[PDB]
Design a protein around this ligand. Sequence first.
Ligand SMILES: [Ca+2]
Ligand SMILES: [Zn+2]
Lengths: 319, 325
Amino acid sequence: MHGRLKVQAEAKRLEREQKLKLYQSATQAVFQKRQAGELDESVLELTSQILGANPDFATLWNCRREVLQHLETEKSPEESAALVKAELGFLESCLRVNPKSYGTWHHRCWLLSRLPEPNWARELELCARFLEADERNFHCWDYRRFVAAQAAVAPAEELAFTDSLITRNFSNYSSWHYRSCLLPQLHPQPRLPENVLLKELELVQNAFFTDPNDQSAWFYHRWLLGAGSGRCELSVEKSTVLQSELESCKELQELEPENKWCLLTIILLMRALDPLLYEKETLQYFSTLKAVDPMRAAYLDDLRSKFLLENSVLKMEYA
Amino acid sequence: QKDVTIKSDAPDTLLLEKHADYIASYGSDDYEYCMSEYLRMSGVYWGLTVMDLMGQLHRMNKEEILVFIKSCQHECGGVSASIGHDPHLLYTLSAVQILTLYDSIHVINVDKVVAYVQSLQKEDGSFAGDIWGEIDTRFSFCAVATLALLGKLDAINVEKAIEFVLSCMNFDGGFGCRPGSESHAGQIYCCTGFLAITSQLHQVNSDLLGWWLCERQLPSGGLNGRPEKLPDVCYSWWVLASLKIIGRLHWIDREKLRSFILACQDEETGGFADRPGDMVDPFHTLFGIAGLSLLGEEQIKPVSPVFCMPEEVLQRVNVQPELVS
Ligand SMILES: [Ca+2]
Ligand SMILES: [Zn+2]
């Protein structure tokens, strides 16, 4: 939840005492009302104050839902639609203030899920707005997938939204992640098709040459490297692309010699091409990588040992 | 690239006696305290757990908390964060964790806790947090963590529970809230804990996830919860505990992490902050201490990376998940 602030200081300590009493009396009353079975708009009022400042007070979200449910039975569909539209406005004012609260996002999904005519395009537009403010807001990305499902939005449309998100700025981990789940849906086998993979390789390689410090594209690139054929199954095209990637990373390594991502990728590319043929260079690359990225020396030694082992198995396989 | 720089007068020694005092006294009005009523049960779990790890549990009020816990169990069997608040899996776990530290599980109706948890499982094996239907692998963890401490894991559909959690496994080796959600430290902790408890760690790509987790360590030595975020004591606990569960704790620099966590201590007030120079809280104090324990601190009791409770409590109740090593 909240964490944290840095460590006239009486008018700050005064106002805190003042807000507590309003919070305290309001909370008191909502509970009194609730125990009294008073499921009315006074509870919606009382809770709107508290939830705006504490959207993690889950029991109050629950109270709202009880009020809303009860009222829906005893109100015309015109009075019910009005209470609903007020609730959408309330939710949005809450999210503008704290866009990372489980409670508020869940209440919105609960709300939208039970509406007779939900306006999903409007909800997707809400997501677009929140994702411009914070393109790593996983609550919002999750709400966006929920909406997309509800509106039976096609993976290709979400794939286009991810492309527009990637070229236009950094903070792309969330967007690459979404692509990793979208692409397999477009090509749905019980390991992406080569043509698609090769295209994704092109797109990710652009990203990490555009910004070599963008870790998200390097992490996605490593998945792409595994998500394919095999080294004695390399097409001339894949072989050529991966070779071209290797030289391009070495070019990068010339420019950014402290860039650990490009070094690790060179090793993984060589593995992907020919473990034994590239054995000496791989070992050379480990020593360099470990000097560049010492916090990871333990990881890197374990990876190298895994690879040395695989190389022993490949040499034994010799006819 | 985002990171903190540790100021050179930062604390570099373990202020155990100060943390004991900070927690011993916590909840004696107070702003954040009254405002945190909606999570009281878990606050109580954080305080008691950290005290017990420092050998200081006796300084807390057993009798008083036992009464409090009992009055938080509702008629459906679930437990609320506080008296009058609504029952939820999160506080059901916390309560069961407290009663386990105290060896007083029959202070509540265990048959009804089990029935409550069992009721929250959905057809796909997922768990809702409460009757209002929020689905999150956090709740999959809370459910089995709760049932394991009670010896009632068999009460739920475990295979479907497993299937749902693995369906939240992502391209990077990590796990999300729900199918298609992005990986992050807190979620990975919940799901790796879940798989420890259900004996499924063989289904984790330990090397791949291990790497994603060790890449959380920033030059300052603190760990972040995901790429392009700041380091933090809570994220650090989740990541390190996850690494231990999958047998790859050695993949981070332990001495640099130790220094980050020690530097998040308040020399004056005791307790730990989320990062150095911020204000302490009991949440980050549990995790600071638990993290240091996992890093090998001999003054702190050994802590379970799955249950975030002292191993000796778990040994006593006989719940000790095999890890990956
Ligand atoms: Ca006592
Ligand atoms: Zn934190």
